[PDB]
Design a protein around this ligand. Structure first.
Ligand SMILES: *[C@@H]1O[C@H](CO[C@@H]2O[C@@H](C)[C@@H](O)[C@@H](O)[C@@H]2O)[C@@H](O[C@@H]2O[C@H](CO)[C@@H](O[C@@H]3O[C@H](CO[C@H]4O[C@H](CO)[C@@H](O)[C@H](O)[C@@H]4O)[C@@H](O)[C@H](O[C@H]4O[C@H](CO)[C@@H](O)[C@H](O)[C@@H]4O)[C@@H]3O)[C@H](O)[C@H]2NC(C)=O)[C@H](O)[C@H]1NC(C)=O
Ligand code: NAG
Ligand code: NAG
Length: 231
């Protein structure tokens, strides 16, 4: 029943700097001002319900996903390393139409000779708005003092799930137990020449006494009756 997909595209940070202005590696050079060491960037994505108080201490009701080190400084996210893009937060209820989202870009060292790593928060963004179920991506781009993160987000229903909250189930069928498709809200729209609850009954031709339907618009005659309509 539906899923919220957040697809990260590009994180920009050519200077390898921090939320507080300093550099992630912590060492520059005397002249100029550029730094040395780059910024090993991970991400944390928290999706929660719209709770109308814009607070960050509440629980991530949908998910609290942590990303491995994807790149250094500026990163082109639009691969693997165990990470899936887009990130999917599934649900089993009606989509509430509203949501709250936290996305953090983090620095994190990764030297195999250390028993403890060094982490620095690079950027934090909050997205809390009303979102409708649609196959179109909504693209945004958050820009801080040094860093920029571009992403797409949307909610789409799972397979065989129609409706506005992705709750009404419907599967097309074309066998002895039904011949039909589904509409936009999830109603069983039947193929031409079918009828009934699941539309397992064919529709014969104009007339047909004694004759019956094995397939739509046809009539099989019984003993003692000929013609087209099996009169
Ligand atoms: C911190 O560093 C860790 C080590 O990385 C090293 O450091 C730097 C210098 C890198 O440039 C790199 O070159 C170094 O190796 C790093 O650990 C790595 O973590 C990832 C995910 O957390 C692991 O990925 C998994 O890999 C296997 C297969 O990988 C093979 O190929 C690679 C190269 O292509 C080799 O390096 C490996 O040794 C293997 O030979 C995948 O199969 C697996 O996907 C599976 O996911 C689930 C299981 O969880 C299954 O259900 C799926 O079906 C898949 O089978 C992952 O993609 C990677 O192995 C690991 N490296 C090593 C050496 O163990 C870590 O990510 C860095 N960051 C953090 C935050 O820790
Ligand atoms: C890198 O991202 C840009 C979008 O900013 C895209 O045009 C390009 O295709 C990406 N790189 C590759 C190798 O596709
Ligand atoms: C991007 O930022 C917020 C949504 O996070 C919204 O107020 C703004 O209008 C968005 N702009 C575009 C062009 O999507």
């Amino acid at each position: 029943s539906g899923s919220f997909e957040l697809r990260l595209k590009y994180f920009s940070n050519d200077h390898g700097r921090d939320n507080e202005g300093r550099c992630c590696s912590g060492e520059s050079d005397g002249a100029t001002g550029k730094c040395l060491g780059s910024c090993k960037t991970r991400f944390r994505v928290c999706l929660k319900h719209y709770q109308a108080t814009i607070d960050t201490t509440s629980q991530c009701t949908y998910g609290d996903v942590i990303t491995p080190i994807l790149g250094e400084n500026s990163v082109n996210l639009t691969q693997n390393k165990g990470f899936t893009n887009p990130i999917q937060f599934p649900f089993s209820f009606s989509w509430p139409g509203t949501f709250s989202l936290i996305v953090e870009a983090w620095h994190d060292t990764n030297n195999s000779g250390n028993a403890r790593t060094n982490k620095l928060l690079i950027q934090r963004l909050l997205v809390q708005q009303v979102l409708e179920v649609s196959s179109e991506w909504k693209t945004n781009k958050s820009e801080s003092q040094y860093t920029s993160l571009e992403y797409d987000f949307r909610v789409t229903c799972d397979l065989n799930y129609y409706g506005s909250g992705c709750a009404k189930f419907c599967r097309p069928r074309d066998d002895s137990f039904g011949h039909s498709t589904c509409s936009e809200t999830g109603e069983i729209i039947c193929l031409t020449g079918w009828q009934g609850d699941y539309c397992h009954i064919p529709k014969c031709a104009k007339g047909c006494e004694h004759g019956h339907c094995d397939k739509p618009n046809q009539c099989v005659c019984q003993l003692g009756w000929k013609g087209a309509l099996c009169n």
